[PDB]
Nucleic acid binder design. Structure first.
Ligand SMILES: Nc1ccn([C@@H]2O[C@H](COP(=O)(O)OP(=O)(O)OP(=O)(O)O)[C@@H](O)[C@H]2O)c(=O)n1
Ligand SMILES: [Mg+2]
Ligand SMILES: [Mg+2]
Ligand SMILES: [Zn+2]
Length: 463
RNA sequence: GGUCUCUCUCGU
RNA sequence: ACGAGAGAGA
């Protein structure tokens, strides 16, 4: 992904889009009970913690583009993946605006506690002014779309969140693209049934884990990924996608049976326009993370990428013995023989991809179930029932969340949520966690889940 | 101050 | 089941 041009809003006639500059993350009453090295991300250009030009760091993720048209390996990869999806029988028909706005049993409705994007953001109008859950009316929406049309520019914000201090110093905060409600509901109408199918079949057939529950999915992963494992993260995944991969995505969508009208929207994703403060800018390539179906499309492109790198990098690869699941750019995959991920990365850099170990560490090493991670969680077999697998969130990542808050009114909700992650690390680590919470006044006022009840509730999930 | 998924909590 | 809120993950 590379920025093509940057004109002021005056020259493009776009309305300015004003974004918050102050973090909502105050330190919590547990801020000094637990060690930790994450701080709220840099959001103002004058953040004293900066050591690099701010706006230059945010946009440094647009590495640039390499390929524009698919080669032989990427075509073969795309078709292999697409024939895999055929067995799901995606209904490619247009979804109706009622279900697209208000949801179905396998696709939650448009979030009305969040913005409506350009231009509504600047016009003061909110999503709840167009859609009501109770009537499930679409007339108010059908009207507005007719009036502003589609291909509406994305609104660029910086994300308020705890980040590494390396990334605070180097100004590498995350950019999100606020979709226009019009673009969002049109994508849902075009691809609603594919979203539905993906959410309802996490696993190695979608090659996706969107919709999975780690508490139960982890026990299946060793069965869905037999053989020797490998695993990746990508550095700057969304911006690092050259337009070739969107062409390759069109190949997949055609081959599962979408109309020439439907695949035409892919170019609207490969080629996007964004407002940030008082400027407009055009991005070619790169996924606009914040669009409808971000996770699902990131995951599908990843299935294409991995396949394409294997058959290009190694002779004698057989893509039918490959199992993988992707959640966005997180990969966990397996193959009957060991795969030298160092070579897949060399290939990726040729396509403009920066592949890294899952942990984002400096060297690749062998990956097996005892050191694997997916969605930050490890794999730890139960002591009594070794075929059940605990998703283990590391205690350090739990300690970092508990040290901050966006509203102390929710302290108990927060700690409870964290306890439900923590106890998979076992009774000793868990009770060390709970004793720490109890070592401060507010902690002794909180209801904390009892370990055995958590373990009993977990074991009941398999009945 | 986006798209999603998952889990929890509070309400007839 | 339906509404309200939270946390985590991508
Ligand atoms: N809050 C987030 C985080 C992730 N993503 C999507 O998931 C992708 C990968 O997630 P992640 O690895 O966390 O971010 P990266 O872009 O790869 O940056 P990094 O180098 O830090 O891994 C992103 O590119 C983005 O498209 C998202 O939409 N919203
Ligand atoms: Mg990444
Ligand atoms: Mg990732
Ligand atoms: Zn353009």
């Amino acid at each position: 992904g590379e920025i093509q041009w940057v004109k002021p809003n005056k020259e493009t006639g776009r309305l300015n889009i004003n974004g918050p500059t102050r973090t909502k993350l105050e330190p919590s009453v547990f801020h000094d009970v637990f060690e930790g090295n994450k701080e709220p991300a840099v959001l103002h250009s004058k953040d004293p913690r900066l050591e690099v030009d701010f706006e230059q760091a945010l946009f440094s993720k647009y590495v640039g583009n390499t390929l524009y048209e698919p080669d032989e390996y990427i075509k073969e990869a795309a078709l292999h993946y697409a024939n895999q999806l055929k067995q799901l029988d995606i209904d490619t028909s247009q979804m109706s605006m009622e279900e697209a706005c208000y949801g179905t049993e396998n696709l939650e409705a448009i979030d009305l506690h969040t913005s409506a994007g350009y231009p509504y953001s600047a016009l003061g109008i909110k999503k709840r002014d167009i859609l009501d859950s109770t009537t499930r009316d679409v007339s108010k929406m059908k009207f507005y779309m007719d009036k502003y049309g589609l291909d509406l520019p994305y609104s660029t914000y910086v994300k308020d969140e705890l980040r590494s201090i390396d990334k605070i110093k180097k100004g590498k905060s995350r950019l999100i693209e606020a979709s226009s409600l019009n673009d969002s509901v049109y994508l849902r109408m075009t691809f609603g049934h594919l979203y539905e199918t993906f959410h309802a079949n996490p696993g190695t057939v979608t090659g996706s884990a969107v919709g999975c529950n780690p508490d139960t999915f982890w026990s299946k992963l060793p069965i869905l990924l037999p053989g020797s494992l490998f695993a990746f993260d990508y550095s700057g995944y969304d911006a690092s996608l050259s337009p070739v991969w969107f062409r390759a995505l069109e190949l997949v969508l055609r081959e599962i049976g979408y109309s020439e009208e439907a695949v035409s929207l892919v170019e609207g994703i490969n080629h996007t326009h964004h407002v940030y403060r008082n400027k407009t800018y055009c991005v070619l390539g790169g996924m606009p993370s914040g669009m409808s179906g971000t996770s699902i499309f990131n995951s599908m492109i990843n299935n294409i990428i991995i396949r394409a790198l294997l058959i290009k990098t190694f002779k004698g690869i057989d893509l039918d013995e490959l199992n993988m699941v992707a959640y966005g750019d997180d990969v966990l995959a397996s193959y009957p023989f060991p795969i030298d991920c160092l070579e897949l990365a060399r290939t990726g850099k040729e396509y403009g991809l920066t592949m890294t170990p899952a942990d984002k560490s400096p060297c690749f090493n062998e990956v097996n179930w005892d050191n694997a991670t997916f969605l930050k969680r490890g794999f730890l077999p139960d002591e009594q029932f070794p075929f059940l697998i605990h998703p283990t969130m590391p205690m350090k990542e739990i300690h970092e969340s508990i040290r901050w808050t966006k509203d102390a009114r929710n302290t108990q909700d927060h700690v409870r949520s964290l306890c439900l992650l923590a106890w998979h690390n076992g009774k000793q680590e868990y009770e060390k966690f709970v004793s720490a919470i109890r070592s401060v006044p507010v902690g002794k006022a909180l209801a904390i889940p009892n370990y055995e009840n958590l373990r009993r509730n977990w074991l009941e999930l398999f009945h």
